Amino acid sequence: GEWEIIDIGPFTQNLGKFAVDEQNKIGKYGRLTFNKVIRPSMKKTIKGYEYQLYVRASDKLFRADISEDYKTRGRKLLRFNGPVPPP
């Protein structure tokens, strides 16, 4: 596919909420509270999309990679790591 910078509107914020909810199921960083997705957010095409976000949760910053299937709209958290340096 092709990588691009995308906005941080509702769609993108919800991807960040998803990432935190999925992290919380795994419990890797304990139970986090989604704050916000900050810039920059990146998207690639895959049949679907891959998203790489900076996610603020419980006042710390994480990087999350999320995939989304085009036809079903089903999502997967691929990676959730941090804390990371600010962009």
Numbering used by the authors: 1 to 46, 56 to 96
The study reports:
Monellin, isolated from the African plant Dioscoreophyllum cumminsii, is, together with thaumatin, one of the most potent sweeteners known, being about 90,000 times sweeter than sucrose on a molar basis. Wild type monellin has a cystatin-like fold, composed of two non-covalently linked chains, which dissociate when heated above ~50 °C. This is accompanied by taste loss and prevents the use of the protein as a sweetener above this temperature. To circumvent this inconvenience, single chain derivatives with higher thermostability, among which MNEI, have been designed. All sweet proteins elicit a taste response upon interaction with the human taste receptor T1R2-T1R3, a heterodimeric G-protein coupled receptor (GPCR) located on specialised cells on the tongue.
